[PDB]
Design an enzyme around this catalytic site. Structure first.
Site, PDB file in Angstrom:
ATOM      1  CB  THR A  50     -34.718  34.719 -69.676  1.00 28.17           C
ATOM      2  OG1 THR A  50     -35.855  34.108 -70.299  1.00 28.17           O
ATOM      3  CG2 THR A  50     -33.451  34.241 -70.361  1.00 28.17           C
ATOM      4  CD  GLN A  51     -31.802  34.572 -63.523  1.00 33.06           C
ATOM      5  OE1 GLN A  51     -32.842  35.231 -63.517  1.00 33.06           O
ATOM      6  NE2 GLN A  51     -30.712  34.948 -62.868  1.00 33.06           N
ATOM      7  CG  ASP A  96     -38.455  35.772 -72.889  1.00 29.51           C
ATOM      8  OD1 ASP A  96     -38.925  34.659 -72.604  1.00 29.51           O
ATOM      9  OD2 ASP A  96     -37.372  36.188 -72.430  1.00 29.51           O
ATOM     10  CG  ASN A 107     -37.984  33.420 -64.224  1.00 26.89           C
ATOM     11  OD1 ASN A 107     -37.096  33.680 -65.035  1.00 26.89           O
ATOM     12  ND2 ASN A 107     -38.712  32.313 -64.294  1.00 26.89           N
ATOM     13  N   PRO A 108     -36.800  37.397 -64.568  1.00 24.65           N
ATOM     14  CG  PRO A 108     -34.811  38.538 -65.009  1.00 24.65           C
ATOM     15  CD  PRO A 108     -35.384  37.437 -64.163  1.00 24.65           C
TER      16      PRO A 108
END
Lengths: 227, 201, 240, 238, 213, 47, 215
Positions: free
Chosen positions: G1-2, G59, G104-105
């Site tokens: 999530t950006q 998440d 893509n953290p």
């Protein structure tokens, strides 16, 4: 039995036993471990006078202290020698040191019996390995089936029965170098058919203080004429 | 960082410094820059440590494979060519590498120059690094072909002394290697300050 | 006797002999029965020690697939292990995609399609397993299903898999199956398994009993069979 | 007998004979014996040689800090399952940062050896694993088979003429559970000295012992910490 | 945006002796203007003669430590013997180039004994060079520690000062003094000191506190 | 062990006592027959 | 999530004698709008360990799903073996590092609390993979605000009781209600002991405003 993917009702290797049979037709070779160093010999079986003797390879050079000898089929030996050369160089790449001979032969027998045509055939060569690791000299013998073992003085190929018998007659643990050399070529000129001369056989001796040049070149003539 | 090399009648002279900074900060003083590829090849370190080290070690691997397959020692031009072919496959991705290749041949002396831009060229004199121009100047002063041995030693040593005296990115121990017909031979390992006392007057 | 090699080919009279031979492979396997009550499903397997080399607690054919579903396999054990892993994977996909417990009909249909897909082609053989599937839900009651080696999957009240397939259901069906809770059915299955083959062909066997229903609040686990010890003090009273 | 060639074919009596042939290929290995106490698990194998001068082909090999296997049968499949074993060990040792329980590893071994026993194009693995390990609940002695029907025991023995060993294990499996390491190991070789014909005796160079303990890391021994293990015996009752 | 790196700081010291290799490191792990902990030892004991320290980004340090442990077990379980020191250095250099185009933001110092039974310290860089030196200081307090070691270990820039070989307890008093003197001026240094000593008889450890700010 | 084996065992024991030339059959020779080839072979053992 | 859409806020955790207490509030603010003012931000894992998180709530739902399935799988192995909290910590650390390695953290800040085999455990996992052990954790702005109270009392008293820990958690959540803009007067306390895992109800705070009568 027809096929590498079917066992026997009893305990037959077939796709491998017929390879162990196919070893026996090859030319002979004799290597002997001595704490002074590993010596090694072979017969070329030269057919023609046009057959140039130094072009037939039996003893090739893997490392600066690791020798070899082949058997039976020529080109499976060529495959294994090529890959063995490549992988020791990889070991020197990632470790700045020499891949020891046990690790060499494990690296060969990782795929020395790994024959699969789907998901190719088993190889047809017996190999004799000599080298000098940190534990002194080593003499090593593998087979097509990957069943790799250490041997003190192994003989391969043709006439290996009487080679082993007359070898076990003379050999013990505290032998010397030159005594083992002439004891080997005595066994050779009891198991060969032609007259022993400068062109039939070739030696390969490796010493810890003489790691380089695992070969004798026409001083072998002087060794033969001393019998 | 300043290296040079020049060949003459009695083989090849190779000298280098041993300073490898990090920006404005000096990391070490004893960085052995001339990477010993073979008992018959000498490679250098000219821009970047890791890139030169890795690719020359891989080149040494390839050369040992080549000799063990052909029972015949590799030439110099083949090795420089193999290095250029391996380096060209990452062009534009940000490789800095300006090494030199030295060795003895069947033809005799061999001197090539391989960049990360792939400018594989022959020649007689070369010098790489930030302060290479100083070495070019004093070397192309003192250069000839019919030089002696100790003359060439003093020439290269004076050259590297001038380079480390003027440049800021150079210093450390002055290595000095000598390529012969049979094999290469390390000459000496001389400090800058010892040369300053000796050659200042 | 003419053409029974491949699993793709038909016969001159129209059936696949591979599937028949795989069906009667499980016939030689151990006897495994199952029966449901009005608030649960009870499993039971006649399990035999080889001679004296086992450990009484190895290789248990009572698996545990989902939180409320387990198997009661009989046949080749490793094939049943792989099939149990496939069933765990299917329940995993359903729990991951819909957020609630898998209905047993849908699970059984996916497993039947998987078994049928291993019966279809000529590269592979049909499975050599026959197993049971039980469940319980608060809005569905008790459900007990049954999968043959071919892939025909439908439902029962009671079943039997093994040698004594008929010889268990001869006296399974005389049970008043609806009006009993499963805590009676525990010793009922004990007496049914204990009736068949005390000592005749083999030497000794051993009992396992699995257990799901309302009394476990929807859980599925083996009974504490040592608790209430319901076989032997009634098995010794079932010989007369 | 013309149906008796491949893995895929079910027999008309339902017994796939390739599995039976792999069992018989396992029956021609070396003798080996594994048995556990409540606190220590010991597996002992027997070495052989190609000739007099050569060294002996080894059987006990290391796997992990608490896992060691014995072996019988083929050696290529042995080293194949060895590399897979070490791989799955260091996989969970990387990910979960814990030592593996033995049962899930052997379930992975069965699931590994399932595929070459059902599809066409691979052979069943001629293999003779005797696995010793330590989870939280003490020592475990598992065995495998080429049919992947892995067993848990308290004392097994596989290989050539291993049945007299099994009789000894029958008449001392009650006695096994109480003792410490030393007499346990000598019960193991009081199985191995009956895995041999009576006209020759077990020497140093042909026997191998691997102990794993609840506080003791898995360690192989050869002739030198086995010379302590070989004394403390009498002759056979001739 | 998302930044893949962060500066965790730390200070690792190494001294190569005649027959010993001392590696010490503070145990402060911080980020920005906070303190995460006061116990996180940068040192790691690989074999009986090898200790590795890892500073910089901490997660890459943990990952690299575990991968090195795995390959140590692979060499041992393949070749019946432990690695040397230079073999471990070579292997780490191969790893650090094997992630060249996404580097670890990690300084690395390997200390240990050679095969002669002498001290050997192999330093590193984030990209994969190495060399056998007598002393290194890695991390945030590198520049606060290198010139003093040039004064004491190297005996540099001095006149009529003979060269005495560096003993053990002298090295101990050196390490304690340099960590006190560097923790006075550094912001990424203090609250403890984990001193690892590698001899020919095993590994010793020793915990010496510092100032608590 | 089927009859034939056991019959081959007892005949083996008889001929074993015949080897030394005995007048009697010792349980040693009986165990020799028991532990004879038992129609089992061989082995090579070959790898 | 950006870009994190719906963020939580600070999570507090501290060990005591034979247990770990974790408390987080129940607010789902989007930007400045407190859009989801009744949500649960602590998962009670099977019987020993326990999870609480910050950052993107979606998440956390995802990791709730994956961790729930893995724990269900090991409990269906039937071997009698479970996950240690440190194993969960290791798996989650490797998951976040392999997540962020692909650029893509997962925008989270997670707290793992567990008590297994006599010893407590309280682990931290960052988005970047930064992971360690600590006797008291504080996330988000809690590491700026309620961290020095924890580190004061742990310096003033190295061991604790459950009552002292619970009172201290109540005081810290009161402080976070005083001067965090992303905070809300509804929180739940979760506690693990050897007796099991317990989630308390939606408690609230007792506030003071007697400085407002001043100028």
């Amino acid at each position: 039995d027809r096929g590498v993917n079917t066992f026997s009702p009893e305990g037959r290797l077939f796709q491998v036993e017929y390879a162990i049979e196919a070893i026996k037709l090859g030319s002979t070779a004799i290597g002997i471990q001595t704490s002074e160093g590993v010596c090694l010999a072979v017969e070329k079986r030269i057919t023609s006078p046009l057959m140039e003797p130094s072009s037939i390879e039996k003893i090739v050079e893997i490392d600066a202290h690791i020798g070899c000898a082949m058997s039976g089929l020529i080109a499976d030996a060529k495959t294994l020698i090529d890959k063995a050369r490549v992988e020791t160089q990889n070991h020197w790449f990632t470790y700045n040191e020499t891949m020891t001979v046990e690790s060499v032969t494990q690296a060969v027998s990782n795929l020395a019996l790994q024959f699969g045509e789907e998901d190719s055939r088993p190889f047809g060569v017996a190999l004799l390995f000599g080298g000098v690791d940190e534990k002194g000299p080593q003499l090593f013998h593998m087979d097509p089936s990957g069943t790799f073992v250490q041997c003190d003085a192994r003989a391969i190929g043709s006439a290996s029965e009487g080679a082993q018998s007359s070898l076990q007659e003379v050999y013990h643990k505290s032998m010397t170098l030159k005594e083992a050399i002439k004891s080997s070529l005595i066994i050779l000129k009891q198991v060969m058919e032609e007259k022993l001369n400068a062109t039939n056989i070739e030696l390969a001796t490796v010493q810890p203080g003489q790691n380089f040049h695992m070969f004798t070149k026409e001083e072998l003539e002087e060794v033969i004429k001393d019998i | 960082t300043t290296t040079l090399a020049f060949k003459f009648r009695h083989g090849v002279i190779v000298a280098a410094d041993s300073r490898a900074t990090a920006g404005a900060y000096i990391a070490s003083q004893t960085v052995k820059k001339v990477i010993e590829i073979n008992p018959y090849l000498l490679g250098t370190m000219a821009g970047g440590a890791a890139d030169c080290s890795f690719w020359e070690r891989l080149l040494a691997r390839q050369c040992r494979i080549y000799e063990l397959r052909n029972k015949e020692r590799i030439s110099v031009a083949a090795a420089s060519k193999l290095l250029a072919n391996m380096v060209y496959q990452y062009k534009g991705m940000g490789l800095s590498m300006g090494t030199m290749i030295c060795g003895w041949d069947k033809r005799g002396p061999g001197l090539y120059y391989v960049d990360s831009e792939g400018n594989r060229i022959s020649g007689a004199t070369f010098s790489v690094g930030s302060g290479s121009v100083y070495a070019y100047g004093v070397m192309d002063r003192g250069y000839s072909y019919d030089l002696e041995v100790e003359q060439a030693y003093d020439l290269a040593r004076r050259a590297i002394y001038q380079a480390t005296y003027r440049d800021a990115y150079s210093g450390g121990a002055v290595n000095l290697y000598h390529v012969r017909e049979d094999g290469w031979i390390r000459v000496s390992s001389d400090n800058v300050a010892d040369l300053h006392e000796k050659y200042s007057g | 006797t003419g053409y029974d090699l491949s699993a793709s080919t038909f016969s001159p009279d129209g059936r696949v002999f591979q599937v028949e031979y795989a069906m009667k492979a499980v016939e030689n396997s151990s006897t495994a029965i199952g029966i449901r009550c009005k608030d649960g499903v009870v499993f039971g397997v006649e399990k035999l020690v080889l001679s004296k080399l086992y450990e009484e607690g190895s290789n248990k054919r009572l698996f545990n697939v989902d939180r409320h579903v387990g198997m009661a396999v009989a046949g080749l054990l490793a094939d049943a292990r792989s099939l149990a892993d496939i069933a765990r994977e299917e329940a995993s996909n359903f729990r991951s995609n819909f957020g609630y417990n898998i209905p047993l009909k849908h699970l059984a249909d996916r497993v039947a399609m998987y078994v049928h897909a291993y019966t279809l082609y000529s590269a592979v053989r049909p499975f050599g397993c026959s197993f049971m599937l039980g469940s319980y839900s608060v809005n569905d009651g008790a459900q007990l299903y049954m999968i043959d080696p071919s892939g025909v999957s439908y439902g029962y009240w009671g079943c039997a898999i093994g040698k004594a397939r008929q010889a268990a259901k001869t006296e399974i069906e005389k049970l008043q199956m609806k009006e009993m809770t499963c805590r009676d059915i525990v010793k009922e299955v004990a007496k049914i398994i204990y009736i068949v083959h005390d000592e005749v062909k083999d030497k000794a066997f051993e009992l396992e009993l699995s257990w799901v229903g309302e009394l476990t609040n929807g859980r599925h686990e083996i009974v504490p069979k040592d608790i209430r010890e319901e076989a032997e003090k009634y098995a010794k009273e079932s010989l007369k | 007998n013309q149906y008796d060639n491949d893995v895929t074919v079910w027999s008309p009596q339902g017994r796939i004979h390739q599995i039976e042939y792999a069992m018989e290929a396992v029956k021609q290995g070396s003798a080996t014996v594994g048995l556990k106490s409540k606190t220590h698990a010991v597996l002992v194998a027997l070495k052989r040689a190609q000739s007099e001068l050569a060294a002996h082909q080894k059987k006990i090999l290391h796997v992990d800090n608490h896992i060691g296997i014995s072996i019988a049968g083929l050696t290529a499949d042995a080293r194949l399952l060895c590399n897979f074993m070490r791989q799955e060990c260091l996989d969970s040792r990387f990910v979960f940062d814990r030592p593996l329980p033995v049962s899930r590893l052997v379930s992975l071994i069965g699931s590994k050896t399932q595929i070459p026993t059902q599809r066409y194009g691979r052979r069943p693995y001629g293999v003779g694993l005797l696995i010793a390990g330590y989870d939280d609940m003490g020592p475990h002695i598992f065995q495998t088979c080429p049919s992947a029907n892995y067993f848990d025991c308290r004392a097994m023995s596989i290989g050539a003429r291993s049945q007299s060993a099994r009789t000894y294990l029958e008449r001392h499996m009650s006695e096994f559970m109480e003792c410490n390491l030393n007499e346990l190991v000598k019960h193991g070789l009081r199985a191995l000295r009956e895995t041999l014909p009576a006209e020759q005796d077990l020497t140093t160079k042909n026997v191998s012992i691997g102990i794993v303990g609840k506080d003791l890391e898995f360690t192989i021994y050869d002739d030198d910490d086995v010379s302590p293990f070989l004394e403390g015996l009498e002759e056979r009752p001739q | 945006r998302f930044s893949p790196y962060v500066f965790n700081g730390g200070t690792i010291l190494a001294i190569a002796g005649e027959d010993f290799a001392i590696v010490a490191s503070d145990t402060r792990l911080s980020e920005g203007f906070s303190i995460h902990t006061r116990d996180s030892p940068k040192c790691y004991k690989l074999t009986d003669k090898t200790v590795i320290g890892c500073s910089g980004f901490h997660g890459d340090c943990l990952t690299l430590t575990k991968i090195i442990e795995a390959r140590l077990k692979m060499y041992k379980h393949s070749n019946n013997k432990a690695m040397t020191t230079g073999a471990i250095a070579a292997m780490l250099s191969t790893i650090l180039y094997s992630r060249r185009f996404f580097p670890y933001y990690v300084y690395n110092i390997i200390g240990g004994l050679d095969e002669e039974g002498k001290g050997a310290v192999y330093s590193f860089d984030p990209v994969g060079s190495y060399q056998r030196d007598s002393f290194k200081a890695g991390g945030s307090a590198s520049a606060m520690l290198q010139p003093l070691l040039d004064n004491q270990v190297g005996f540099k820039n001095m006149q009529n000062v003979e060269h005495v070989p560096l003993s053990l307890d002298r090295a101990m008093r050196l390490v304690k003094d340099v960590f006190i003197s560097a923790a006075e001026r550094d912001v990424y240094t203090g609250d403890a000191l984990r001193i690892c000593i590698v001899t020919k008889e095993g590994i010793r450890e020793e915990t010496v506190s510092l100032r608590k700010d | 062990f089927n009859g034939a084996q056991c019959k081959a065992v007892c005949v083996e024991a008889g001929m074993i006592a015949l080897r030394r030339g005995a007048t009697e059959l010792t349980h040693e020779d009986y165990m020799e027959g028991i532990l004879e080839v038992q129609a089992k072979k061989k082995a090579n053992l070959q790898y | 999530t950006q870009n994190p859409m719906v963020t939580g806020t600070s999570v507090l955790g501290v060990k005591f004698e034979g247990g770990v207490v974790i408390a987080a509030d129940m607010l789902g603010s989007y930007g400045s709008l407190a859009r989801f003012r009744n949500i649960s931000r602590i998962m009670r894992v099977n019987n020993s360990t326990m999870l609480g998180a910050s950052g993107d709530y979606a998440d956390f739902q995802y990791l709730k799903q994956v961790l729930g399935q893995m724990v269900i799988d090991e409990e269906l192995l039937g071997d009698g073996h479970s996950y240690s909290p440190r194993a969960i910590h290791s798996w989650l650390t490797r998951a976040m590092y392999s997540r962020r390695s692909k650029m893509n953290p997962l925008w989270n800040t997670m707290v793992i609390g567990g008590y297994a085999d006599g010893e407590s455990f309280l682990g931290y996992v960052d988005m970047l993979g930064v992971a360690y052990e600590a006797p008291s954790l504080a996330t988000g702005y809690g590491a700026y605000l309620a961290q020095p109270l924890l580190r004061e009392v742990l310096e003033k008293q190295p061991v604790l009781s459950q009552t002292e820990a619970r009172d201290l958690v109540e005081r810290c959540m009161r402080v976070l209600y005083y001067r965090d803009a992303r905070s809300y007067n509804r929180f739940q306390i979760a506690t693990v002991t050897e007796k099991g895992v317990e989630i308390e109800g939606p408690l609230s705070t007792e506030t003071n405003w007697d400085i407002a009568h001043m100028i």
